[PDB]
Amino acid sequence: IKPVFERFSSVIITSGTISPLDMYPRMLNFKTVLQKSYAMTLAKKSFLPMIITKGSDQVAISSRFEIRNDPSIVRNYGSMLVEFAKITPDGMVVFFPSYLYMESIVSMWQT
């Protein structure tokens, strides 16, 4: 991106969830003449973020690459899966850090 920098002055950079900003002029040897962020002035909140650190059994939950094959935490995870599967009206997506691990857990889930 250095030839982009010395080729173009009006280089304007934006993204959606880039937070925070400071390490990007670190990882890329550049600076901006100005930079800030924007949050919406929405009327009432309609996205609902919460952090679940525990199942309904109050068991701590994680997806570390060592404890990923822990069947008790797996059962807790599938209890959550059951409870959103019972209530999902239209669509719902689940991600994981690693595709091999997804195939492993879904394989034993189907099992």
Partner 1 sequence: FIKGATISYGKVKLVIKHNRYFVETTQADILQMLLNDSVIGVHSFEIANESVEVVKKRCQEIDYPVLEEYDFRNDHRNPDLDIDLKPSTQIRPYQEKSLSKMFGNGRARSGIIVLPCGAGKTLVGITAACTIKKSVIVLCTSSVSVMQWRQ
Partner 2 sequence: ASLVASIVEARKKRTAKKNITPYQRGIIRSLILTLDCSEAMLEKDLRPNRHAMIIQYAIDFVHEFFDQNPISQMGIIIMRNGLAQLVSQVSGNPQDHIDALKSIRKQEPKGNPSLQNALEMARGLLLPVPAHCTREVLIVFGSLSTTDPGDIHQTIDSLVSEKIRVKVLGLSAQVAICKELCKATNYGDESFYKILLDETHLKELFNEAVTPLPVNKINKGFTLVKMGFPTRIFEDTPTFCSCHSKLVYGGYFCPNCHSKVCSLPTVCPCCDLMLILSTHLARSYHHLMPLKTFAEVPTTEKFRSEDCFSCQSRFPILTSSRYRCEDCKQEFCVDCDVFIHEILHNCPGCESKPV
Residue whose token pair is 């409870």: 83
- When the beta carbons of 66 and 90 are compared against partner 2, the nearer one is 90
Rounded distance between C-alpha atoms, residue 37 and residue 75, angstroms: 41
The C-alpha atoms of residue 25 and residue 21 are separated, in whole angstroms, by 8
DSSP string covering 68-80:
GG-HHHHHHHHHH
Question: Which of 27, 33, 60, 94 contacts partner 1 by CB under 8 A?
Answer: 60
In the list partner 2, partner 1, none, the entry touching 89 (Cβ below 5 to 8 angstroms by class) is: partner 2
Q: Which residue in 7, 12, 39, 57 binds partner 1 (CB under 8 A)?
A: 57
Residues near partner 2 (CB under 8 A): 87-90
